[PDB]
Amino acid sequence: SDDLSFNFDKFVPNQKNIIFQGDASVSTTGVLQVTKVSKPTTTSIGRALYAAPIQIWDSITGKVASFATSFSFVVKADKSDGVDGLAFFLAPANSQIPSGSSAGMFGLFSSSDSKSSNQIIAVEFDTYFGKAYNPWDPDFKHIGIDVNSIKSIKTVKWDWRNGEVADVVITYRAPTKSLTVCLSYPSDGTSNIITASVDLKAILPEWVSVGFSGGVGNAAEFETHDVLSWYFTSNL
Amino acid sequence: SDDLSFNFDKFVPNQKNIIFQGDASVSTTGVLQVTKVSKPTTTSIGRALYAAPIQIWDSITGKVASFATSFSFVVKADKSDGVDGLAFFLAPANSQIPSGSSAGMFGLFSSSDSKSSNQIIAVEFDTYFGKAYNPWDPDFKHIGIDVNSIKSIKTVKWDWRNGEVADVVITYRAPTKSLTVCLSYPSDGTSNIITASVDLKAILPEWVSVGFSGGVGNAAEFETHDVLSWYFTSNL
Amino acid sequence: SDDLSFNFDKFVPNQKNIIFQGDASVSTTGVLQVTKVSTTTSIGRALYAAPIQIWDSITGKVASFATSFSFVVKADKSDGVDGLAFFLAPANSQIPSGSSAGMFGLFSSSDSKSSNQIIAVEFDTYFGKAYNPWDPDFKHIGIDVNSIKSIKTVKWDWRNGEVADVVITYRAPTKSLTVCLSYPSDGTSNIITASVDLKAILPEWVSVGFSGGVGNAAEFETHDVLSWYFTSNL
Amino acid sequence: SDDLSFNFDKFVPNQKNIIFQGDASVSTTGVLQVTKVSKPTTTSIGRALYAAPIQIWDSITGKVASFATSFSFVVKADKSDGVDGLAFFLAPANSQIPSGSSAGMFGLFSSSDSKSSNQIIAVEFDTYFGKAYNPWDPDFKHIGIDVNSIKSIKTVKWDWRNGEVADVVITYRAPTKSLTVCLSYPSDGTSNIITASVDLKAILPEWVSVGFSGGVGNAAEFETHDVLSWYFTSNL
Numbered sequence: 025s026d027d028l029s030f031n032f033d034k035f036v037p038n039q040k041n042i043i044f045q046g047d048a049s050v051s052t053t054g055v056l057q058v059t060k061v062s063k064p065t066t067t068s069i070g071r072a073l074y075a076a077p078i079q080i081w082d083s084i085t086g087k088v089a090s091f092a093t094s095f096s097f098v099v100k101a102d103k104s105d106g107v108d109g110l111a112f113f114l115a116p117a118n119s120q121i122p123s124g125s126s127a128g129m130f131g132l133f134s135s136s137d138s139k140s141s142n143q144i145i146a147v148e149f150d151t152y153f154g155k156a157y158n159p160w161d162p163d164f165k166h167i168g169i170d171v172n173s174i175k176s177i178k179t180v181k182w183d184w185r186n187g188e189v190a191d192v193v194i195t196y197r198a199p200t201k202s203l204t205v206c207l208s209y210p211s212d213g214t215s216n217i218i219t220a221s222v223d224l225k226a227i228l229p230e231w232v233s234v235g236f237s238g239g240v241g242n243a244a245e246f247e248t249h250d251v252l253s254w255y256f257t258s259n260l
Numbered sequence: 261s262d263d264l265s266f267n268f269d270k271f272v273p274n275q276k277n278i279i280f281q282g283d284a285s286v287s288t289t290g291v292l293q294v295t296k297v298s299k300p301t302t303t304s305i306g307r308a309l310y311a312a313p314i315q316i317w318d319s320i321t322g323k324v325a326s327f328a329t330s331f332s333f334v335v336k337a338d339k340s341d342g343v344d345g346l347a348f349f350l351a352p353a354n355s356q357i358p359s360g361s362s363a364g365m366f367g368l369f370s371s372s373d374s375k376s377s378n379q380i381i382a383v384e385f386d387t388y389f390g391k392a393y394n395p396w397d398p399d400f401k402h403i404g405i406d407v408n409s410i411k412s413i414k415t416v417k418w419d420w421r422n423g424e425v426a427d428v429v430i431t432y433r434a435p436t437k438s439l440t441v442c443l444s445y446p447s448d449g450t451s452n453i454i455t456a457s458v459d460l461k462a463i464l465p466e467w468v469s470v471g472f473s474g475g476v477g478n479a480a481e482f483e484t485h486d487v488l489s490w491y492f493t494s495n496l
Numbered sequence: 497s498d499d500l501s502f503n504f505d506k507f508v509p510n511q512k513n514i515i516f517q518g519d520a521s522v523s524t525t526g527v528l529q530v531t532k533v534s535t536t537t538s539i540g541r542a543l544y545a546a547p548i549q550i551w552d553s554i555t556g557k558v559a560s561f562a563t564s565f566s567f568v569v570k571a572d573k574s575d576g577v578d579g580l581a582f583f584l585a586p587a588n589s590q591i592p593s594g595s596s597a598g599m600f601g602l603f604s605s606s607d608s609k610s611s612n613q614i615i616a617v618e619f620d621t622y623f624g625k626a627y628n629p630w631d632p633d634f635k636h637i638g639i640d641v642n643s644i645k646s647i648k649t650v651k652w653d654w655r656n657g658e659v660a661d662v663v664i665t666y667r668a669p670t671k672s673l674t675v676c677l678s679y680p681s682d683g684t685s686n687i688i689t690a691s692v693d694l695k696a697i698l699p700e701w702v703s704v705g706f707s708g709g710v711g712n713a714a715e716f717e718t719h720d721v722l723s724w725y726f727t728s729n730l
Numbered sequence: 731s732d733d734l735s736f737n738f739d740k741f742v743p744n745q746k747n748i749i750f751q752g753d754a755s756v757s758t759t760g761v762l763q764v765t766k767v768s769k770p771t772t773t774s775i776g777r778a779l780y781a782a783p784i785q786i787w788d789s790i791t792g793k794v795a796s797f798a799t800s801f802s803f804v805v806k807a808d809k810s811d812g813v814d815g816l817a818f819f820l821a822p823a824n825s826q827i828p829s830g831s832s833a834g835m836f837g838l839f840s841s842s843d844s845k846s847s848n849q850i851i852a853v854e855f856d857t858y859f860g861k862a863y864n865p866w867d868p869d870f871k872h873i874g875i876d877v878n879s880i881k882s883i884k885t886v887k888w889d890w891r892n893g894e895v896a897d898v899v900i901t902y903r904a905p906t907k908s909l910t911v912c913l914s915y916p917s918d919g920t921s922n923i924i925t926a927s928v929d930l931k932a933i934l935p936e937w938v939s940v941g942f943s944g945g946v947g948n949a950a951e952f953e954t955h956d957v958l959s960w961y962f963t964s965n966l
């Protein structure tokens with residue numbers, strides 16, 4: 025049946041079906057630390073992609089793929105606040121971190137402009153919204169749908185819980201071009217949701233790579249960006 | 261792998277793998293009308309269950325099942341308002357509509373009391389909250405998590421859209437006992453979400469039947485309760 | 497995606513999603529004994545509780561399906577009767593009046609009536625010409641279409657008390673039905689394929705399951721299925 | 731649920747999730763020609779692997795994976811006979827064609843010795859058994875289970891049909907270490923089967939790449955080695 029379906033209940037150090045870029049890696053406890061967690065802390069940018077590209081749309085038949093993904097993640101800050109955030113994304117097949125990318129752009133963008141050549145769709149869990157540094161951001165931690173730009177086309181207030189596990193379910197229904205983000209914290213019932221219209225055929229190439237990215241722009245306001253598990257399915 | 265998984269992209273008149281109770285039926289256009297839609301309007305109560313019971317928990321091993329379900333539905337009211345609502349539920353294997361049930365109880369309850377003998381867990385999409393007849397309801401249309409009672413243990417404001425298709429994803433994660441309801445309207449981006457803790461092993465018997473139920477208590481304030489598609493998976 | 501997909505790694509006593517007919521039941525050890533184990537003559541069938549749409553009359557589409565199961569046939573002596581079968585019958589079908597162990601509770605007679613609407617894969621242990629004149633001269637795997645007299649058979653190298661793994665696939669576009677049997681204990685393998693048009697034999701809605709029989713208490717054997725996987729898609 | 735599951739109903743020219751080695755490629759008609767079809771004909775060796783490695787066993791837990799795969803293929807010879815054959819295999823992650831490999835070794839082996847360092851398990855559909863060049867082969871076209879050597883640990887007569895489509899189902903049940911090969915020709919009912927005991931944990935590394943390989947050692951006895959579709963699943 026379905027074109028593709030994979031599931032990681034846990035990660036293993038030096039997992040061969042995951043492409044690690046930047047500081048991303050998996051600890052001995054089995055968690056994907058997309059951002060570096062080290063004794064003397066430090067600035068960091070990392071991305072982790074599934075090793076095989078996925079056909080998101082077909083130019084022959086014109087068909088677009090519907091997909092669903094689920095993952096659990098933890099963002100633990102030392103103080104009461106941290107930077108910069110985590111993102112789930114779709115980019116051109118075997119994409120590399122752009123030259124001159126920063127933590128605030130999650131290793132996804134070279135700048136704050138909206139270039140159609142970026143060919144990136146991402147769901148961000150943005151923890152830093154400082155106005156002189158991230159002027160494009162709203163005045164609160166948020167969940168945003170990014171389409172070719174770090175300046176989200178739509179955002180929603182994210183009630184982040186320090187050190188608590190968040191369960192996320194993202195669905196893309198091709199026939200209606202609807203992208204829905206479902207987030208909940210089992211520990212206390214906190215839930216956030218956001219949906220937006222996005223035509224994948226219009227933004228991305230036929231073959232894409234999916235994964236996570238994140239960054240810590242200021243070592244003094246450190247936080248982790250750990251993903252505990254990951255499920256993904258797609259079908260044309 | 262997984263214990264059970266079924267998918268209905270559409271329904272067919274007199275579908276043999278669906279048990280119809282009350283006024284529930286599937287039209288020639290392939291939609292499950294859990295509530296009766298007729299030239300001259302009338303009061304109605306209906307339920308539709310998947311024909312085979314599902315083991316939600318094992319008494320031998322003590323294991324509890326995790327499940328996920330997705331469905332799209334439409335509630336179209338003649339005037340600007342309608343009654344009474346729709347519900348997705350889990351009940352004892354091959355459960356029948358209780359004697360003396362009403363539209364306001366969605367054919368799930370005999371009364372407004374919280375009896376542990378009911379053994380019912382349901383997610384309701386309640387359109388009628390009139391304090392004269394439904395005193396247990398909040399002052400707005402809502403999504404509620406019902407556990408052995410029509411008086412929800414938790415509700416959230418439901419931004420119902422007249423005649424628009426709503427996509428719903430319900431997930432139950434056994435290890436954390438977390439039940440999450442994710443609703444969105446692709447037509448305009450409206451999204452509602454709610455999460456609650458529920459121990460299935462404590463409320464339901466080992467074998468249950470899953471399905472939809474609904475009711476129209478006042479023909480003068482008529483509305484449809486149509487489910488367009490349905491996906492379901494469970495695993496112990 | 498796929499219309500239906502279920503999996504039983506083990507069975508549980510009085511499983512609610514299985515319809516038991518005749519002497520079929522599940523033991524406390526979690527195995528489906530389609531035939532009664534205790535001794536006496538027996539006939540039993542076990543069906544999945546929900547019907548399955550095998551073909552659509554609107555679109556004309558036919559469903560492709562795959563199933564996998566493991567079973568054991570343990571005889572007391574060096575031989576036993578009568579066999580086990582995997583089948584597709586009309587939705588919520590009952591055991592026919594006057595059925596016998598040699599017909600696995602699937603047929604009223606040895607005639608080929610199109611009204612039977614039955615397709616079955618049999619693992620036939622008894623081929624005595626006295627009671628089963630339609631059978632070949634050896635234990636076999638047969639593809640039955642509306643009759644106990646198989647349209648095609650193949651020698652079955654049955655192993656007493658050993659677990660057999662079976663994979664049955666039906667590829668609708670080519671109308672091909674393949675039966676794949678193997679004994680992990682010693683490598684013994686048997687295979688058979690035949691052309692069958694489901695749309696021509698069965699109604700839109702069918703019930704799937706197992707059936708079996710022990711026609712002679714003196715030549716007793718079990719007909720136990722240990723696990724079961726099934727998928728179908730239109 | 732399941733670790734991995736992919737399905738190709740057809741192939742597309744320059745498919746990004748398939749690694750092509752040697753002469754392997756996919757035609758405009760959507761078929762994977764692991765061997766070159768040029769006419770002007772020529773000698774050829776080709777391999778096609780799924781782009782992402784698969785974890786076949788875990789050294790931490792000791793668990794071994796069970797897997798199932800299905801594919802349809804055609805071997806069309808110009809004359810009444812052709813060479814050399816096709817193979818489905820599991821090799822070390824991102825394995826390359828060995829230096830000095832030949833068509834009779836399907837681009838899998840450097841020699842006819844049984845080296846444990848080869849770390850290869852393959853199911854071959856061998857069309858050439860000439861004792862002059864393939865002395866290790868039996869006296870008929872066959873299906874063989876290869877474990878670290880081109881000299882099969884077990885074979886069975888293969889009733890090859892020129893130009894007809896063959897459906898193959900290969901299952902590996904970890905608990906019993908049983909590998910079963912199920913082949914059938916829908917056109918005439920011809921069926922062949924073979925099973926053998928193989929401990930994956932003992933032969934292969936934790937991470938492996940799966941795919942097809944084939945060869946045409948003599949351009950004068952040309953034949954195609956086309957795979958039409960491919961399904962694969964694995965679970966630890």
Ligand SMILES: *[C@@H]1O[C@H](CO)[C@@H](O)[C@H](O)[C@H]1NC(C)=O
Binds near residue numbers: 122123133135
């Ligand atoms: C932005 O990133 C792209 C990709 O690496 C690169 O080609 C471009 O030069 C970058 N812009 C700058 C100013 O570095």
Ligand SMILES: *[C@@H]1O[C@H](CO)[C@@H](O)[C@H](O)[C@H]1NC(C)=O
Binds near residue numbers: 370371
């Ligand atoms: C309420 O429902 C229960 C279950 O069907 C039934 O036993 C009880 O008698 C009902 N109450 C009335 C008044 O019928």
Ligand SMILES: *[C@@H]1O[C@H](CO)[C@@H](O)[C@H](O)[C@H]1NC(C)=O
Binds near residue numbers: 591
């Ligand atoms: C054979 O079985 C069918 C179905 O139960 C029944 O209608 C028929 O009368 C049976 N024949 C006899 C002789 O009982």
Ligand SMILES: *[C@@H]1O[C@H](CO)[C@@H](O)[C@H](O)[C@H]1NC(C)=O
Binds near residue numbers: 827828829830839841
């Ligand atoms: C055989 O293949 C291996 C792998 O490429 C290589 O290391 C070796 O040198 C080759 N030749 C011989 C003679 O083994």
Ligand SMILES: [Ca+2]
Binds near residue numbers: 108109128152153158
């Ligand atoms: Ca930011």
Ligand SMILES: [Ca+2]
Binds near residue numbers: 364388389
């Ligand atoms: Ca109400």
Ligand SMILES: [Ca+2]
Binds near residue numbers: 578620621623624628
């Ligand atoms: Ca017989």
Ligand SMILES: [Ca+2]
Binds near residue numbers: 815856858859
């Ligand atoms: Ca050879």
Ligand SMILES: [Mn+2]
Binds near residue numbers: 161174176
């Ligand atoms: Mn932002």
Ligand SMILES: [Mn+2]
Binds near residue numbers: 396397398412
């Ligand atoms: Mn309510």
Ligand SMILES: [Mn+2]
Binds near residue numbers: 631
């Ligand atoms: Mn027979």
Ligand SMILES: [Mn+2]
Binds near residue numbers: 854856867868874882
């Ligand atoms: Mn050989």
